[PDB]
Design a protein around this ligand. Structure first.
Ligand SMILES: O=C(O)c1ccc(/N=C/c2c(-c3c(Cl)cccc3C(F)(F)F)noc2-c2cc[nH]c2)cc1
Ligand SMILES: CC(C)=CCC[C@@H](C)[C@H]1CC[C@H]2[C@@H]3CC=C4C[C@@H](O)CC[C@]4(C)[C@H]3CC[C@]12C
Length: 241
């Protein structure tokens, strides 16, 4: 039996250990929705308190993605420069993809601080167009009904992309990429799920949305710096200043 069957198992294990929120929990909690009063309470919070809360949650989400990457076979054998290039370009893209598990398309709500709420929860941030675009992206992804292994293999490939500008050992990233592509396509064939391939997001769209999102987080961080629970100095240094 294949190195490729083992790679599937190892990527899904890494995802299971780092997925942050369990899918059964997220699905069971869908009926737990913020009340009108609770939504108004969030809308009345300071922009800067909502930013502190959201920035903290997003930092934590990024760190789970870093831990996911560190567990992908061969990722720790890449040189540090390339590790950082890959994580800088792709970790927030993965966070945006992971969001769809916590998104309920029936009422367009996301799981946030223990209950589901719509995008109006975030009104104090004054980012309605960007936040609407983030909700719209999860709405599009939710139509695929991604399984846990599909999310694991797809987000591994979001990260392990040999086309990212600035890699120093491109051939070594290509080797991991090809094996992950084969793992993903083998798994979709085995589960009769190859039809999702044509429905995956155009790559330019995830990159565009992520670039706009990170640009806004950078603006907030310039205006109102946050305390970061920093665990990854080389990555922190690339993003914070
Ligand atoms: O533990 C560590 O060391 C560490 C290091 C870095 C981290 N995240 C950096 C962020 C942020 C971001 C966030 Cl999440 C919140 C507030 C402000 C920002 C800002 F934009 F300012 F950077 N946004 O995208 C990334 C990113 C993109 C690719 N890779 C990381 C998180 C933990
Ligand atoms: C534009 C701006 C200033 C903020 C974005 C507002 C909002 C869209 C952000 C704030 C917190 C985020 C969640 C945080 C954690 C997770 C868990 C992860 O496993 C999956 C992703 C998820 C649920 C994040 C989704 C995006 C949220 C709600």
């Amino acid at each position: 039996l294949t190195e490729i069957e083992h790679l599937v198992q190892s990527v899904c294990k890494s995802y299971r250990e780092t997925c942050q929120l369990r899918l059964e929990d997220l699905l069971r909690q869908r009926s737990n929705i913020f009340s009108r009063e609770e939504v108004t309470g969030y809308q009345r919070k300071s922009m800067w308190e909502m930013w502190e809360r959201c920035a903290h949650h997003l930092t934590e989400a990024i760190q789970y993605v870093v831990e996911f990457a560190k567990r992908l076979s061969g990722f720790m054998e890449l040189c540090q420069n390339d590790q950082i290039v890959l994580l800088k370009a792709g970790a927030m893209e993965v966070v945006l993809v992971r969001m769809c598990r916590a998104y309920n398309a029936d009422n367009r709500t996301v799981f946030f601080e223990g209950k589901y709420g719509g995008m109006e929860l975030f009104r104090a941030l004054g980012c309605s167009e960007l936040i609407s675009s983030i909700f719209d992206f999860s709405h599009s992804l939710s139509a695929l009904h991604f399984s846990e292994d599909e999310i694991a293999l797809y987000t591994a490939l979001v990260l392990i992309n040999a086309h990212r500008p600035g890699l120093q050992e491109k051939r070594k990233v290509e080797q991991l990429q090809y094996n992950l592509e084969l793992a993903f396509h083998h798994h979709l064939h085995k589960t009769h799920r190859q039809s999702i391939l044509a429905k995956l997001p155009p790559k330019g769209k995830l990159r565009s949305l992520c670039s706009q999102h990170v640009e806004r987080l950078q603006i907030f961080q310039h205006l109102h710096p946050i305390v970061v629970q920093a665990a990854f100095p080389p990555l922190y240094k690339e993003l914070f200043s």
